[PDB]
Amino acid sequence: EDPLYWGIAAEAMTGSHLDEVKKMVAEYRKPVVKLGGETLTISQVAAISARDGSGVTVELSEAARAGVKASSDWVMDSMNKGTDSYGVTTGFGATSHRRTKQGGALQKELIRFLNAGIFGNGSDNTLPHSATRAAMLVRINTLLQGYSGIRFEILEAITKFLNQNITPCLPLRGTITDLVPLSYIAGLLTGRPNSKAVGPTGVILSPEEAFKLAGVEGGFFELQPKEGLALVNGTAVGSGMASMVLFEANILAVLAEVMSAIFAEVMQGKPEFTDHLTHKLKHHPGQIEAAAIMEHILDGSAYVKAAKQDRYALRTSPQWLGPQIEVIRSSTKMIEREINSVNDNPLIDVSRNKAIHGGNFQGTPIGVSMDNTRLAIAAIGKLMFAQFSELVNDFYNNGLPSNLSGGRNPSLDYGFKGAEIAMASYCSELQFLANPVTNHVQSAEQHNQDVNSLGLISSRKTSEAVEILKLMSTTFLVGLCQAIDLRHLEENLKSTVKNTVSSVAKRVLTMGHPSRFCEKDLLRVVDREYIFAYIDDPCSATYPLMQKLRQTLVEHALKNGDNERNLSTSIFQKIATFEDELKALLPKEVESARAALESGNPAIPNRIEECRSYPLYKFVRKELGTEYLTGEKVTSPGEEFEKVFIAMSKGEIIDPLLESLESWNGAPLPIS
Amino acid sequence: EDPLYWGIAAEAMTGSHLDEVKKMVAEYRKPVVKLGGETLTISQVAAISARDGSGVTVELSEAARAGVKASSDWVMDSMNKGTDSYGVTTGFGATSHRRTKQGGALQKELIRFLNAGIFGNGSDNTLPHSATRAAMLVRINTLLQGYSGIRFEILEAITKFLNQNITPCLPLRGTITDLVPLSYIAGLLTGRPNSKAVGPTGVILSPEEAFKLAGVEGGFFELQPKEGLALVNGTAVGSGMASMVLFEANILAVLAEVMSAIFAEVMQGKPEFTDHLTHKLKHHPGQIEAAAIMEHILDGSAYVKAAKQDRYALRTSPQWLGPQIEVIRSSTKMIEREINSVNDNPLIDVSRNKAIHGGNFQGTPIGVSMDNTRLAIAAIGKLMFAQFSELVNDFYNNGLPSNLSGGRNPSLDYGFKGAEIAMASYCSELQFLANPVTNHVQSAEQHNQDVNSLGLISSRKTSEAVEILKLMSTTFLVGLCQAIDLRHLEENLKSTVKNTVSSVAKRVLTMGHPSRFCEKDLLRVVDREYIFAYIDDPCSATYPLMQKLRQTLVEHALKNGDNERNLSTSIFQKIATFEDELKALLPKEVESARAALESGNPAIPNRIEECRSYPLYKFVRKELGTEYLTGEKVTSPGEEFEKVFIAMSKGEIIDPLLESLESWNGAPLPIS
Ligand SMILES: *N[C@@H](Cc1ccccc1)P(=O)(O)O
Ligand SMILES: *N[C@@H](Cc1ccccc1)P(=O)(O)O
């Protein structure tokens, strides 16, 4: 028994976040959005909001028509009897004491005075057309429930505008949540002289042109009583935009979880930070899930198979992301309820033969969910900035080059240093955007609206935060792929150094007849030393390779006892010879190895090919043609970022992201 | 000609910030604050606000009495003729349409209904008594100008309350700027039954007890027409607190400038970042002054005399602090005007025989100056956090121990690591506090007060920020003194290592008969190496001293040519002997040197004794008894922080701070 509907809401929060995202993605890709008033999802809003030629269409449920007609007939019938009804024969808001019997004239006036927005020139003060399409879809879904008193034919007209991608121009600002912007949809439907629409290629259209292109026949609508109020008195603009925002935010949270694991891989972090006991003992489900996802990536990693504590951006990443995922998930359910709500006033209850006055236009679920989600996005951004900062810092990245520089000459390759500065600027602006909107409520409309939600303004700020998080995710992802390629370079160049030191050691020290403990210790120097600390000038006397090799020969000479006092068996007398032979040979050997790797024929294959995270690397590197960055070529990091950012904004990252987890059974690895 | 008073305001911003602070400090210490209505400074407010037994007294200018009596007589005379006057025979605010001829009864009612604050139990909802004293002083200064229509005897009564440290209890909250809190001063003067005061030792007093202790004779006042409005209708609580805040903020900005220079000293930064050409070419006077002050400290530094680029918290510190100083200075002039303004309504103009209605109670200068100053305080804090972070990090602090650890065993001394975490918590809360208050205005009082300044709320938040900045300054200052002592330890232990290496080198290598290029190169190793990288275990084979000493002997052996092939002149055959003699001798020599330094008899004196910054170190170390922190003793960093924080809060840091600059002539060093 669930009289206040807490139970059905709680049921919607079972199962994993990842399974919800997989469902959202499948829903988004369906060819038809069937609207009945109560099954709209944020992924259907996101799909319809697109203006990218996907071909998705909207169709209205015929099962809804009778209820819609009933309340429309009720309103018309109550005019014929000549009663007194708010928004039908009375004024609006604080001025509702005015009376009139010109019902159609009142609705015409309503749309006129709500057309109070400012467009100016250009598009800077215009609502994005995708958000207008989202608003149109959500408004239809509300009106289909049959409590609003509007003709079904008007909903059919809005549906044609959606399906033919003919979009009314709406002002960006003007709403405290959505009378003013929704009145520009009504104005297009009634052919107001200032009404404008945009066609699929951006052409500005008159209302007559828009009706013709959309396939609306019958001329402009003449609003019947209540129909203007039914069009404008709801939360569709704020909730439609919040839906688009949350669709991307849910995906980006999964991307942040997977990139935390790929980060761990290339950093050679200790995978035990994902151990399920740690997360089980905190009970938080977002943290448990985030750990299990990272553990899944790491359990199928060829880098972990190649393995005092890691720093917090690695080791506390499940604790950090967990509550953000929970907020984004909870916020999604709030918005999904809002886009299926009857946000209108008054409500026509034909069953009780009366209009019910209330406050369902008050968009508080939008403002709250968008403020909370914006703070969650800023936190995901801050972690990404901290991880990126560790990745490019040679003090912390366990042997990767400073700046992830790629070329032979570090003096002419500063790698990701510019990107790192950009990442700080993204993170800083994201922390600014994290401030709430909903604590700035003004007592409005002659103090009739003395609380108001500010939902659309908050959705807009969260939309801006998501865009910045995509800039950060793009830059981080390209950095991770650079690091992957640097680990491949590292393993191959280390193997070449080992082989060269071994061949020289044999040839020079095979006397004093074979110095064998010496050769193995020299090889241990190579195993121990960071390749990128010396490989740009491997035989330099001031770099660690030659210094530690000599130190090893000296250590063996001091332990060589009596044999060291005979020039024929002296290890010390071999040092100058060893160093000369190595200087003559190691440079060209390192160059040949690097050239071979650059030609696609490395001695050791790139281990990423055997990792579960390979689909993301493969997509960035092979599908998108993003290239390894190097000061030896003219290509800038931004040119590579463009490829990933544009693909990300087209949804092309979704498939390789989910592919990286597709064999996960949804449970953590056993701890018993 | 200066008809809008821009010119006289601009004149107040000439001369250096430091000279203004020196004047403020002298003003604060004067024994008598003489009030005439128009010469009050923030330093006089700060001095009077103190409840620390300084003995400062207030006295009222007799020259003010005639104007005060004139407007008080005017109000009484306009009652006798029976006219209509706002706040005298009419209601208040939005209810000013009500009429009455009971003039005294109206003022009694005014104080009753404004007594709408909440104290609860304890002091958490009570205005601090120092801020109440500031408010009382500022209100007298306003009323002395003679435009308010109040009896001079009431001002004399408030003066006795100040001079005898009898303070009415005021609620902390209740004002949008200061009717509600000021009505509790009026309530004490009229003996309201709920009125309470506090004596000098905290005893709660009835109004009768308070009058007796303060020396007010004549019984409770019975307010004459307008007198209640004259007491409560002004900005004295917000501006009084802003004055106290800005007094400390001005001093702390000079402290931040000087600590930036001491930071540069102990970091061995390049002093050229203070070069006047750099700052001259930006024109900003705060930056030019901040550079010249730091340059003055550094020009008299015995550490700079002992000397690719420094990091931003050092090298951009004048650029960073400059605009903060300008904001604090500009904000000070705004508040100094406000505390000398006639913030009251209506104004009695006996010259024109009329009351002038206006808005001078609108405390916008307070809200703006306190919001801007709070952001400036957060910026000074952020720089201090960044400097402290560099100071304790061995990657960045040019040879100081990680954490500024002080004991012989770093495994049992983590120095300032706890303080560093605390500094992040201080900085984080300061950045939170930097948000403004004045963008949260509500339309208030039946929408009569549809804009309001929120000045006191903003002053309170800036007061909290200043307190945190004092926590940060205390912790940083103790860290700087720790670093000073570590540089003293460093120079002495390095000298001992050099002498020991030299004596061993002589004794062991004086054969092959004296290895002289060898000895000088071994000494160059000691000169080059960071003492704190090895001095806890100086003869360890895995530490850099023994490694680089051996490397030097090996390098000389490889250059020794034919003599190296004879065991009698072999340098390589001396290594094991050299290392054994050094291991037998260097440990006890280092210990004797450290013990001698710990006993006050170092071989090399502490160079701080010859620096211009010595007064601050001497005060912290000798006057306050703050001690060098070491894991070898039980004393915690917090115990030492307490000494400095308490002294700082008593103003005891002012004298050594200004002493460090007292020979500065106020100009930068020539660049031509
Ligand atoms: N949200 C109000 C409708 C309205 C329309 C136009 C102007 C002002 C208000 P409600 O439904 O609460 O009357
Ligand atoms: N600031 C107003 C005085 C007032 C006193 C008590 C209640 C409400 C207002 P004003 O001087 O503008 O009338």
Q: Which residues in B412-426 are b (16+ Cβ under 10 Å) and which e?
A: ebebbeebbebbeeb
Structure tokens at B274: 């203070």
Name the packing angle between helices A455-509 and A637-649 (round to 10°).
130
Q: Kindly state the tokens that stand for A482.
A: 């650079």
Measured in whole angstroms, the distance separating CA A315 from the mean position of its chain's CA atoms is 22
Q: Do residue A151 and residue A171 come from a single domain?
A: yes
> What is the distance between the terminal CA atoms of chain A, rounded to a whole angstrom?
38
Q: Which atom of ligand 1 is nearest to the CA of A345?
A: 11
Q: What is the DSSP string of B480-533?
A: HHHHHHHHHHHHHHHHHHHHHHHHHHHHHHS-----HHHHHHHHHHHHHS-GGG
In the block, tokens 């330890």 appear at B489
The residue from A606, A632, A657 where one domain ends is A606
Number of structural domains found in chain B:
3
Q: What are phi and psi of A349, to 5 degrees?
A: -105, 90
Q: Which residues of B touch A561 (CB under 8 A)?
A: none
Residues of B engaging A, defined by a Cβ cutoff of 8 Å: 395, 435, 439-440, 442-443, 447, 547, 550-551, 554, 557-558, 565, 567, 572, 575-576
Identify the DSSP state of B411: G
Domain of residue B72, residue span: 1-235
Question: Are A230 and A241 found together in one domain?
Answer: no
- The answer to whether the CB atoms of A439 and B440 lie below 8 A apart is yes
CB count, 10 Å around CB of B227? Answer: 28
- Give the burial class of A307: count Cβ atoms within 10 A of its Cβ; 0-12 exposed, 13-18 middle, 19 or more buried: exposed
The dihedral through the CA atoms of A641, A643, A648, A649 has a sign that is: positive
Q: Where are the alpha helices (DSSP H) in B393-454?
A: 417-433
Report the CATH number at residue A637: 1.20.200.10
The DSSP code for B624 is: S
Is the separation of the CB atoms in B244 and B462 below 8 Å?
A: no
Which residue has 């609580």 as its token pair?
Answer: B237
User: How determined?
Assistant: X-ray
CA separation for the pair A430, A380 (Å, rounded): 10
Residue indicated by tokens 């540069």: B264
Ligand 2 site, residue B175, Cβ cutoff 6 A: no
Residues of B noted as catalytic: 86
* Per-residue tokens: B152: 């001079």
Q: Is B354 exposed, middle or buried (0-12, 13-18, 19+ CB in 10 A)?
A: middle
CA nearest to B523, candidates B499, B546, B547 = B499
Q: What residues in B contact A395, CB-CB < 8 Å?
A: 395
Q: CA A366 to CA B239: how far, in whole Å? A: 40
Name the packing angle between helices B17-28 and B236-267 (round to 10°): 120
DSSP 8-class letter at B220: S
CATH of the domain at B570: 1.10.274.20
In this structure, what token pair is assigned to residue B158?
């408030």
A179 and A267 share one domain: no
Q: Please name which ligand lies nearest the alpha carbon of A111.
A: 1
Question: Is the N-terminal amide bond of A346 cis, ω within 30° of 0?
Answer: yes
Contact A88, A106 (CB under 8 A): yes
Closest ligand to residue B451's CA: 2
B210 in Cβ contact with B197 (< 8 Å): yes
CA angle A621, A626, A631 (to 5 degrees): 120
Dmax over CA atoms of chain B, in Å, equals 125
Q: Is B93 near ligand 2, meaning CB less than 6 Å away?
A: yes
* Angle, helices B129-143/B236-267, rounded to nearest 10 degrees: 120
Q: List, as residue ranges, the binding site of A for (E)-cinnamate.
A: 233, 309, 315, 345, 417, 445, 448
Environment class of B439 (CB within 10 Å of its CB; exposed 0-12, middle 13-18, buried 19+): exposed
- Measured in angstroms, the CA of A339 and the nearest CA of chain B are apart by 31
Q: What SS3 class is residue B57? A: strand
- CATH code for the domain in which residue B104 is found: 1.10.275.10
From the CB of residue B125, how many other CB atoms can be counted at a distance below 10 Å?
14
Distance in Å, CA B448 to ligand 2 centroid: 9
Q: At what angle do helices B236-267 and B285-299 cross, to 10 degrees?
A: 40
Residue A262: closest CA among A289, A219, A300, A224: A300
Instruction: Extract the annotated binding site of B.
Output: 233, 309, 315, 345, 417, 445, 448
* CB neighbour list of residue B646: distance below 8 Å, 6 or more residues apart: none
Whether the CB-CB separation of A114 and A232 falls below 8 Å is answered with yes
CB A601 within 8 A of CB B584: no
SS3 B130: helix
- Whether residues A185 and A203 fall in one domain: yes
Say which residues have a Cβ less than 8 Å from residue A228's Cβ, sequence separation at least 6. Answer: A106, A107, A108, A110, A111, A183, A186
> Which atom of ligand 1 sits closest to the CA of residue A94?
8
Torsion-angle region of A445 (φ positive above 0: left; ψ -120 to 50: alpha; else: beta) = left
User: What span, in angstroms and rounded, lies between the C-alpha atoms of A135 and A179?
Assistant: 12
- Separation of alpha carbons B636 and A492, rounded Å: 51
Looking at the partner chain, which of B443, B554, B567 has a beta carbon nearest the beta carbon of A443?
B443
Q: For residues B349 and B353, give the distance between their C-alpha atoms in angstroms, rounded to a whole number.
A: 6
The token pair that represents B609 in the structure block: 């004794």
- Same domain flag for A22 and A139: yes
What CA–CA distance (Å, rounded) separates A367 from A440? 11
Q: Say if the Cβ atoms of B440 and A440 lie within 8 Å.
A: yes
Q: For ligand 1, what atom is nearest to the CA of residue A110?
A: 6
Q: Whose CA is nearest to atom 1 of ligand 1?
A: A233
Tokens of B223: 């307010």
| Residue B172 and residue B51 share a domain | yes
Taking an 8 Å cut-off on Cβ atoms, the answer to whether B576 and A558 are in contact is yes
Q: Which residue of A has its CA nearest to B560?
A: A573
Query: Which helix (H) or strand (E) is B346 found in, with range?
Result: none
Instruction: Return left, alpha or beta for B326; rule: phi > 0 is left, psi -120 to 50 is alpha, else beta.
Output: alpha
What type of residue is A591? E
Residues of A in contact with B442 (CB under 8 A): 443
Which residue in B443, B542, B560 has the most chain A C-beta atoms within 10 A of its own C-beta, making it the best mutation to test that interface?
B443
Q: In this structure, which residue's CA is closest to atom 11 in ligand 1?
A: A345
In whole angstroms, give the CA distance from residue B635 to residue B633. Answer: 6
For residue B118, the number of C-alpha atoms closer than 13 Å in the C-beta half-sphere is 1
For A21, half-sphere exposure in the C-beta direction (CA atoms, 13 angstrom radius) is 25
Q: How far is the CA of A93 from the centre of ligand 1 (A)?
A: 5
Claim to verify: residue B248 and residue B217 sit in the same structural domain: no
- The secondary structure of B58-118, three-state, reads EEECHHHHHHHHHHHHHHHHHHHCCCCCCCCCECCHHHCCCECCCHHHHHHHHHHHHCCCC
Q: Which of A396, A554, A556, A574 to mutate to test the interface with B (most CBs of B within 10 A)?
A: A554
Helices (H), B91-235: 103-114, 129-143, 152-163, 179-189, 207-214, 227-232
Report the alpha-carbon angle B554-B555-B560, nearest 5: 95
Q: Is A108 in the same domain as A125?
A: yes
Give the chain B residue whose CA is nearest to the CA of A451.
B442
Nearest-atom index, ligand 2, CA of B232: 5
Q: How far, in Å, CA of A409 to CA of A536, rounded? A: 6
Residue nearest to atom 8 of ligand 2 (CA): B93
Instruction: Write down the H helix ranges in A447-543.
Output: 455-509, 516-528
Return d(Cα B442, Cα B176) in angstroms, integer: 9
A550 chain-B contacts, CB cut-off 8 A: 551, 554
My answer on whether B665 and B523 are in the same domain is no
Find, in chain A, the residue whose alpha carbon is nearest to that of B547.
Answer: A551
Chain A CB contacts of B567 under 8 Å are 565
Helices (DSSP H) in B233-284: which residue ranges?
236-267, 276-280
Chosen domain end from B235, B266, B283: B235
Inter-chain contact B443–A447, Cβ cutoff 8 Å?
yes
- In short, whether A111's Cβ falls inside 6 Å of ligand 1 is no
Q: How many residues does chain B have?
A: 672
What are the chain B neighbours of A558 within 8 Å (beta carbons)? 575-576
CA angle A65, A71, A77 (to 5 degrees): 125
Is A440 close to B439, i.e. CB distance below 8 A?
yes
In this structure, the answer to whether residues B267 and B180 fall within a common structural domain is no
Distance A233 CA to ligand 1 centre (A): 7
| Closest Cβ opposite residue B565 in set A435, A440, A567 | A567
Question: Before B346, cis peptide (omega within 30)?
Answer: yes
Judge: B575–A565 Cβ closer than 8 Å, yes or no.
Answer: no
One domain for residues A555 and A474: no
CB of A325 closer than 8 Å to CB of A249? no
What angle do helix axes A455-509 and A516-528 make, rounded to 10 degrees? Answer: 170
How far does Cα A622 stand from its chain's mean position? 22
For atom 5 of ligand 2, which residue has the closest CA?
B92
How does strand B57-60 pair with strand B167-168? unpaired
The upper half-sphere exposure of residue A196, i.e. CA atoms within 13 Å in the direction of its Cβ, equals 14
Q: How far is the CA of B361 from the centre of ligand 2 (A)?
A: 9
Distance from CA of A440 to the nearest CA of B (A): 7
Q: Which residues of A43-76 are buried (b: 16+ CB within 10 A; e: fewer)?
A: bbbbbbbbbeeeebebebeeebeebbeebbebbe
Return the residues preceding each gap in chain B, C–N over 2.5 A, or none: 177, 307, 512
**Final residue belonging to a domain, choices B219, B235, B251:** B235
Spatial contact of A569 and A512, defined as CB atoms under 8 Å apart: yes
Residues B183 and B102 in one domain: yes
Separation of CA A452 and ligand 2 centre (Å): 28
